[PDB]
Write a protein that binds this ligand. Sequence first.
Ligand code: MOO
Ligand SMILES: [N+]
Length: 227
Amino acid sequence: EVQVAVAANFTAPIQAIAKEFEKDTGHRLVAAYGATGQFYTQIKNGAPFQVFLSADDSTPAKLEQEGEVVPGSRFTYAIGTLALWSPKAGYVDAEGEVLKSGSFRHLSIANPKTAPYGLAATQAMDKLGLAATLGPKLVEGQNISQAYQFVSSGNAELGFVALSQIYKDGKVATGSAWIVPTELHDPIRQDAVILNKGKDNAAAKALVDYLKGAKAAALIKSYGYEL
Ligand code: MOO
Ligand SMILES: [N+]
């Protein structure tokens, strides 16, 4: 009986971790998907969420500075990666030269004010020196999922997506990708946290002990995350 707030980049991963979770603990994971900032606002307004799996480390810590976090519950459950991606296999090269020289008019990022992966996109465009040239071409999704769908659907020619959305057991499994090297943005450290309303919930404690387990660790590394 555990309400879980899940940043959009971890939509697929948690649905999968929850099948084995239910079968192993008897507790059912009911999760909501969206942007980290949106969940921040909802949690501050009394949303019933009990566990918050963030796409950052900063916002769970911010909720702890604001008294919404069980102290001692904050841990890192996943480290993500940003990838320039397009379903079209010809378009996005393996050094990502298209950012510098492409002919594309639409570039999908996540709302960088609410979506950690969107902030990583803006950071990498900053340190690449392509902020002024790429800014006008940007288009924002409410969350990283919507930014990926803008490309998948055809409303943009490429976008900065979460590696979890294009990654196999080892490999990018679809389209054309450029692994954004980590030197260009802050590492995408994703912190989990138990909220005020999970202080003595057994489904919450069971879930965060299982997110540190072996079944969940093997699934989180199947999606391209590191630990
Ligand atoms: O997973 Mo996010 O918070 O939508 O970038
Ligand atoms: N194509």
